[PDB]
């Protein structure tokens, strides 16, 4: 069974050090959100509350096994707190429920996970329709520069597809943009993607 | 003029546009400030940007002259 694959990959590994062969090469990560719902467009504090799923994909050079000789098992699901994760958080926050990861034979990891976010929104209205509201969602790592971890969007839109058409608020766009943030503390820039949500409403 | 611009990853040197003769430095605050000090925007400008209530803004007219707190000019 796969428990002798899981025998494990985990005596010579614990989530602390980045699973690259040696330190000063880079571990990239693919990131995309799947917007599910606008829980509340708090107009009068300009806070957007939203339910989301967060896709993060990356390679762990230490969690590889040859499949043929483990009775050909392609991949296992395992605890996120048990594998190295890019501690990728919400930069844009204003004010979340643990799951598991699909690790592949080639050391590829796929973590979807759900989120609630209170993020700030801004109005400046024309680009009419009557009322557009811009709500940016900026994600980036909590502990790692682009020289330890670079982070890419899966595509230059935030996935609506399984978006769930709210009755007063209308997603017109959700483009993504990739920036670096400098930060006077030090030490290389901090990569960050920004899903930018633009809504209006029927009257 | 040749200024450092932070639009670039990694940080590096650019020759500013025509008419934008000054190099500048902008620093406001995230609230990552405590954790990773101060956010820095380096670039070019035609006139030194007047700006904000809370800054560590700096102009210069020399080549070289707006480096991040990285090292020295
Ligand atoms: C990081 O991503 C780039 C493409 O975006 C890729 O060419 C590079 O090889 C990746 N890093 C490493 C260490 O392979
Ligand atoms: C949202 O992000 C985009 C790029 O990340 C930027 O053009 C825009 O100014 C941002 N909006 C706000 C309100 O910060």
């Amino acid at each position: 069974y796969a428990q002798k694959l899981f025998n494990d990959l985990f005596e010579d590994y614990s989530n602390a050090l980045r699973p690259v062969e040696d330190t000063d090469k880079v571990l990239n990560v693919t990131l995309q959100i799947t917007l599910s719902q606008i829980k509340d467009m708090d107009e009068r504090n300009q806070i957007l509350t939203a339910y989301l799923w967060i896709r993060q994909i990356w390679h762990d050079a230490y969690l590889t096994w040859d499949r043929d000789q483990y009775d050909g098992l392609d991949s296992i699901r395992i605890p996120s707190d048990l594998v190295w994760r890019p501690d990728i958080v919400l930069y844009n926050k204003a004010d979340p429920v643990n799951t598991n990861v699909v690790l592949r034979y080639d050391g590829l990891i796929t973590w979807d996970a759900p989120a609630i976010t209170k993020s700030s929104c801004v109005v400046d209205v024309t680009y009419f329709p009557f009322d557009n509201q811009q709500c940016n969602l900026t994600f980036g790592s909590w502990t790692y520069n682009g020289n330890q971890v670079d982070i890419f969007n899966a595509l230059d839109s935030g996935d609506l597809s399984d978006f769930i058409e709210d009755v007063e608020w209308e997603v017109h766009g959700m483009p993504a943009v990739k920036n670096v943030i400098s930060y006077g503390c030090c030490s290389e820039p901090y990569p960050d993607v920004t899903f930018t949500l633009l809504l209006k409403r029927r009257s | 003029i040749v200024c450092h611009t932070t639009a670039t990853s990694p940080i590096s040197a650019v020759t500013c546009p025509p008419g934008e003769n000054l190099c500048y430095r902008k620093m406001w605050c995230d609230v990552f400030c405590s954790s990773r000090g101060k956010v820095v925007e380096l670039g070019c400008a035609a006139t030194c940007p007047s700006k904000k209530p809370y800054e560590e803004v700096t102009c210069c007219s020399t080549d070289k002259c707006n480096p991040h707190p990285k090292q020295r000019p």
Side-chain angles (χ1 to χ4, degrees), chain A residues 1-94 96-203, chain B:
Chain A
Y1 263 85
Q3 161 49 249
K4 171 49 174 327
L5 155 66
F6 176 91
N7 46 336
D8 56 21
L9 305 182
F10 305 91
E11 37 280 32
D12 174 41
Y13 177 29
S14 270
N15 61 312
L17 64 105
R18 296 166 47 222
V20 285
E21 74 305 339
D22 62 33
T23 181
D24 40 333
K25 329 214 187 155
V26 121
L27 194 163
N28 309 307
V29 160
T30 316
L31 186 127
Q32 170 167 314
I33 74 182
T34 88
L35 173 75
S36 297
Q37 148 74 332
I38 298 183
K39 172 65 194 199
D40 179 17
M41 187 58 228
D42 195 331
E43 278 205 303
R44 114 153 205 167
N45 294 22
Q46 253 67 26
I47 286 293
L48 165 93
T49 310
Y51 293 137
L52 313 176
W53 289 94
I54 291 183
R55 239 196 188 289
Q56 301 165 57
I57 330 177
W58 73 95
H59 291 85
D60 185 308
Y62 296 77
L63 307 178
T64 63
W65 81 93
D66 178 34
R67 49 173 180 183
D68 55 27
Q69 292 186 358
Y70 279 31
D71 207 334
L73 272 69
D74 161 357
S75 147
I76 61 189
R77 300 182 180 171
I78 44 181
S80 82
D81 67 5
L82 202 41
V83 288
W84 184 86
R85 296 136 289 100
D87 287 301
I88 286 197
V89 323
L90 195 84
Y91 274 20
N92 189 24
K93 210 166 32 200
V97 142
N98 198 20
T99 74
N100 292 284
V101 305
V102 184
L103 165 70
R104 204 165 60 184
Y105 72 82
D106 63 334
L108 171 75
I109 275 178
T110 295
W111 193 25
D112 322 323
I116 312 183
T117 68
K118 326 252 222 32
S119 78
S120 323
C121 300
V122 185
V123 289
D124 164 11
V125 113
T126 192
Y127 314 98
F128 284 155
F130 183 65
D131 316 324
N132 43 290
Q133 261 204 343
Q134 195 197 359
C135 299
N136 278 9
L137 295 158
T138 292
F139 305 72
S141 172
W142 177 264
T143 73
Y144 290 109
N145 47 63
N147 202 276
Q148 300 142 307
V149 176
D150 194 344
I151 75 108
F152 308 97
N153 42 325
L155 51 76
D156 298 316
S157 294
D159 182 32
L160 304 185
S161 97
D162 319 310
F163 160 65
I164 305 180
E165 334 200 355
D166 177 66
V167 42
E168 40 265 9
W169 285 104
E170 291 347 281
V171 168
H172 261 322
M174 206 201 192
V177 171
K178 180 186 179 187
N179 297 340
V180 283
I181 326 287
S182 12
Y183 285 112
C185 58
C186 53
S187 268
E188 329 329 336
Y190 281 120
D192 76 278
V193 305
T194 279
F195 301 90
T196 291
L197 197 42
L198 274 64
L199 325 176
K200 155 58 182 153
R201 175 29 62 249
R202 57 193 56 111
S203 324
Chain B
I1 166 45
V2 174
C3 322
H4 306 263
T5 170
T6 30
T8 197
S9 171
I11 191 75
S12 65
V14 168
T15 320
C16 314
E20 294 186 359
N21 304 323
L22 297 176
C23 289
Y24 77 79
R25 188 166 70 163
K26 227 164 168 152
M27 302 166 91
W28 63 92
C29 262
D30 69 22
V31 197
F32 265 107
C33 219
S34 47
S35 49
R36 43 201 186 194
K38 204 69 196 145
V39 37
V40 187
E41 159 176 327
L42 312 173
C44 292
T47 69
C48 197
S50 196
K51 122 210 73 226
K52 324 309 174 171
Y54 170 57
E55 314 313 310
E56 313 223 350
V57 166
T58 329
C59 259
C60 46
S61 314
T62 305
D63 271 350
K64 284 191 61 47
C65 66
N66 72 321
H68 184 272
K70 64 216 246 185
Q71 307 225 324
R72 138 146 192 102

